[PDB]
Design an enzyme around this catalytic site. Structure first.
Site, PDB file in Angstrom:
ATOM      1  N   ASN A   1     -12.879   4.272   7.388  1.00  0.00           N
ATOM      2  CA  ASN A   1     -12.053   4.580   6.248  1.00  0.00           C
ATOM      3  C   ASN A   1     -12.230   3.483   5.216  1.00  0.00           C
ATOM      4  O   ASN A   1     -11.670   2.374   5.348  1.00  0.00           O
ATOM      5  CB  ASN A   1     -10.583   4.726   6.670  1.00  0.00           C
ATOM      6  CG  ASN A   1      -9.702   5.227   5.544  1.00  0.00           C
ATOM      7  OD1 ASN A   1     -10.187   5.802   4.564  1.00  0.00           O
ATOM      8  ND2 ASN A   1      -8.400   5.013   5.669  1.00  0.00           N
TER       9      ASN A   1
ATOM     10  N   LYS B   1     -11.151   2.334   2.055  1.00  0.00           N
ATOM     11  CA  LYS B   1     -10.006   2.565   1.157  1.00  0.00           C
ATOM     12  C   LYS B   1     -10.184   1.829  -0.177  1.00  0.00           C
ATOM     13  O   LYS B   1     -10.223   0.603  -0.196  1.00  0.00           O
ATOM     14  CB  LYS B   1      -8.726   2.050   1.808  1.00  0.00           C
ATOM     15  CG  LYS B   1      -8.302   2.792   3.068  1.00  0.00           C
ATOM     16  CD  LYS B   1      -7.068   2.140   3.670  1.00  0.00           C
ATOM     17  CE  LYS B   1      -7.413   0.775   4.238  1.00  0.00           C
ATOM     18  NZ  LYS B   1      -6.564   0.488   5.405  1.00  0.00           N
TER      19      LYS B   1
ATOM     20  N   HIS C   1      -1.955  10.057   6.002  1.00  0.00           N
ATOM     21  CA  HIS C   1      -2.265   8.628   6.061  1.00  0.00           C
ATOM     22  C   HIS C   1      -1.155   7.814   5.355  1.00  0.00           C
ATOM     23  O   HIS C   1      -0.464   8.333   4.486  1.00  0.00           O
ATOM     24  CB  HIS C   1      -3.643   8.355   5.456  1.00  0.00           C
ATOM     25  CG  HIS C   1      -4.279   7.107   5.973  1.00  0.00           C
ATOM     26  ND1 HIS C   1      -4.236   5.915   5.287  1.00  0.00           N
ATOM     27  CD2 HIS C   1      -4.903   6.846   7.145  1.00  0.00           C
ATOM     28  CE1 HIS C   1      -4.857   4.983   5.991  1.00  0.00           C
ATOM     29  NE2 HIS C   1      -5.251   5.518   7.133  1.00  0.00           N
TER      30      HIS C   1
ATOM     31  N   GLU D   1      -0.606   5.688   2.971  1.00  0.00           N
ATOM     32  CA  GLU D   1      -0.435   5.538   1.528  1.00  0.00           C
ATOM     33  C   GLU D   1       0.055   6.814   0.863  1.00  0.00           C
ATOM     34  O   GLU D   1       0.649   6.759  -0.214  1.00  0.00           O
ATOM     35  CB  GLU D   1      -1.711   5.006   0.861  1.00  0.00           C
ATOM     36  CG  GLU D   1      -2.825   6.027   0.598  1.00  0.00           C
ATOM     37  CD  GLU D   1      -3.547   6.489   1.855  1.00  0.00           C
ATOM     38  OE1 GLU D   1      -4.151   7.582   1.812  1.00  0.00           O
ATOM     39  OE2 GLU D   1      -3.512   5.764   2.878  1.00  0.00           O
TER      40      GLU D   1
ATOM     41  N   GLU E   1      -1.259   5.513  14.188  1.00  0.00           N
ATOM     42  CA  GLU E   1      -1.419   4.264  13.460  1.00  0.00           C
ATOM     43  C   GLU E   1      -0.044   3.696  13.133  1.00  0.00           C
ATOM     44  O   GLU E   1       0.565   4.070  12.122  1.00  0.00           O
ATOM     45  CB  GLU E   1      -2.168   4.477  12.148  1.00  0.00           C
ATOM     46  CG  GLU E   1      -3.563   5.039  12.293  1.00  0.00           C
ATOM     47  CD  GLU E   1      -4.369   4.803  11.036  1.00  0.00           C
ATOM     48  OE1 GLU E   1      -4.082   5.493  10.041  1.00  0.00           O
ATOM     49  OE2 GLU E   1      -5.259   3.923  11.047  1.00  0.00           O
TER      50      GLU E   1
ATOM     51  N   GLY F   1      -4.005  -2.654   8.173  1.00  0.00           N
ATOM     52  CA  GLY F   1      -4.428  -3.633   7.174  1.00  0.00           C
ATOM     53  C   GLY F   1      -3.872  -5.044   7.378  1.00  0.00           C
ATOM     54  O   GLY F   1      -4.208  -5.941   6.616  1.00  0.00           O
TER      55      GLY F   1
ATOM     56  N   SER G   1      -5.847  -2.152  12.453  1.00  0.00           N
ATOM     57  CA  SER G   1      -6.535  -3.417  12.653  1.00  0.00           C
ATOM     58  C   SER G   1      -7.394  -3.451  13.907  1.00  0.00           C
ATOM     59  O   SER G   1      -7.438  -4.450  14.641  1.00  0.00           O
ATOM     60  CB  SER G   1      -5.543  -4.590  12.571  1.00  0.00           C
ATOM     61  OG  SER G   1      -4.902  -4.536  11.303  1.00  0.00           O
TER      62      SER G   1
ATOM     63  N   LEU H   1      -9.496   5.157  14.056  1.00  0.00           N
ATOM     64  CA  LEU H   1      -9.647   5.141  12.597  1.00  0.00           C
ATOM     65  C   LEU H   1      -9.640   3.661  12.157  1.00  0.00           C
ATOM     66  O   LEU H   1      -8.691   2.936  12.464  1.00  0.00           O
ATOM     67  CB  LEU H   1      -8.515   5.911  11.919  1.00  0.00           C
ATOM     68  CG  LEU H   1      -8.638   6.103  10.404  1.00  0.00           C
ATOM     69  CD1 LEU H   1      -9.913   6.825   9.993  1.00  0.00           C
ATOM     70  CD2 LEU H   1      -7.440   6.895   9.908  1.00  0.00           C
TER      71      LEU H   1
ATOM     72  N   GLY I   1     -10.212   0.816   9.163  1.00  0.00           N
ATOM     73  CA  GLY I   1     -10.275   0.447   7.739  1.00  0.00           C
ATOM     74  C   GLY I   1     -11.082  -0.813   7.478  1.00  0.00           C
ATOM     75  O   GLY I   1     -12.323  -0.784   7.303  1.00  0.00           O
ATOM     76  N   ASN I   2     -10.391  -1.945   7.457  1.00  0.00           N
ATOM     77  CA  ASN I   2     -11.034  -3.215   7.090  1.00  0.00           C
ATOM     78  C   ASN I   2     -12.330  -3.516   7.846  1.00  0.00           C
ATOM     79  O   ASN I   2     -13.345  -3.900   7.243  1.00  0.00           O
ATOM     80  CB  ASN I   2     -10.026  -4.366   7.215  1.00  0.00           C
ATOM     81  CG  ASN I   2      -9.026  -4.383   6.067  1.00  0.00           C
TER      82      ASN I   2
END
Lengths: 245, 245
Positions: free
Chosen positions: B9, B11, B92, B94, B162, B168, B208, B227, B229-230
């Site tokens: 992901n 973002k 999600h 956000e 999540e 994050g 994370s 899933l 992200g960073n």
């Protein structure tokens, strides 16, 4: 002068095939991009396909840019610049309506856009209530002063008056209704930015522009072009471009 | 058995060049897409470039789909299908946080997605307060029941737990924290959809995940992938994919 400016806004609309035949029809129109700005604003995921298909005489932009740390899911100004997207729309009705976007948000979006060398199409306008209740100039004035002082290059920010009651409704402002507001908007720019800047800046009308009403709108002294939604989904959009040629 | 599923992901992140070198590094990893699903979710305007660059072994999706008449500015399920976008993310953090997206919105988005033959990655999780106050299972249960009965094909909807405090933040759930929740999520599916469906559906952890903690997470019986992200912005993401191979 002033260079006229005609924009197509494809809101949540299109298939790969409909874009193919629509862009083909647009491409068939001869106009001079040094004399007239014509910009298409497709859906985000249609941007690259639309840019591929449209001839270079057409400019392109995206319908929104973000203001952080916490990703809102919006496209950033930085990303748009990196993609060489020329224009962004800011303050359009659906951002203000459905997503609580404020005048302060508009200001910051304009800041981010100019910082990142984007040209901005900045929209504002009063609701039906606000007009019926004689508050339109008050409303417009506060909306425009929320950001107008940030403008640096007056070819690169384009103002769009779109009264909310005319957007998607078929209920177009009369030429005189629109002109009255555009005159006053141009005065706000004169008083805040300067006489030369005000005479240079493009102020467009949007709100159910079509092939039948565009000529009488553009003829008005302070109306410099259009943001066109529903009528830009049709091949006859080329006749709206012609009205500004 | 269950086929594992690892998602990236991206973002609000990336340039054309960073995507180029990142996708190149991902392309260097040999894996078998019949055995393992690996999906990348870029920013909307990066979708076509990312799809062009990623080899066919990678699937791709978009980060949101709309629920009308009044265009919200979001990409519709219809548009995604027409573009042959395989996956959509729904629910999600956000969307729920910054855009007021409700459980009812999640349900309707899931409906629209399946109607349009999209595979859905549906996300949910509790805040820090809700966990500290011993409400996590309550919260998750209501979130999952908001939509789980709509599921038809249990290869085509993927659930993602999540917890909001891990997203994050660097503050990953322990394997046992995650597993506890995944066990209970799979029971909700058993009770509502059936024993076979529950044993078939993928339930992923996000929050994370990185190269150091992924192995101990995936080892848990009811955690079927991630899933990410960073850590998916780095070339070392290939080691997180490896942990599921």
């Amino acid at each position: 002068a002033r260079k006229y400016f005609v924009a197509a806004n494809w809101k949540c609309n299109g298939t790969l095939e409909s874009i193919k035949s629509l862009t083909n029809s647009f491409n068939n129109l001869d106009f001079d991009p040094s004399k007239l700005d014509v910009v298409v604003f497709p859906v985000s995921v249609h941007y690259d396909h639309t840019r591929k298909l449209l001839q270079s005489k057409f400019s392109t932009g995206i319908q929104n840019v973000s203001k952080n740390g916490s990703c809102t899911g919006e496209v950033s100004a930085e990303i748009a610049k990196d993609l060489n997207i020329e224009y962004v729309i800011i303050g359009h009705f659906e951002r203000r309506k459905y997503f609580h976007e404020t005048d302060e948000d508009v200001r910051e979006k304009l800041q981010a856009s100019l910082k990142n060398n984007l040209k901005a199409v900045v929209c504002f306008g009063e609701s039906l209530e606000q007009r019926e209740q004689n508050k339109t100039i008050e409303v417009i004035t506060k909306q425009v002063k929320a950001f107008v002082d940030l403008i640096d290059n007056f070819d690169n920010v384009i103002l769009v008056y779109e009264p909310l009651w005319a957007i998607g409704t078929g209920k177009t402002a009369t030429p005189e209704q629109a002109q009255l507001v555009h005159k006053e908007i141009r005065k706000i720019v004169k008083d805040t930015c300067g006489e030369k800047q005000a005479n240079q800046i493009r102020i467009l009308y949007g709100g159910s522009v079509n092939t039948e009403n565009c000529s009488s709108l553009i003829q008005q002294e302070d109306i410099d072009g259009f943001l066109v939604g529903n009528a830009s989904l049709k091949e006859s959009f080329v006749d709206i471009i012609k009205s500004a040629m």
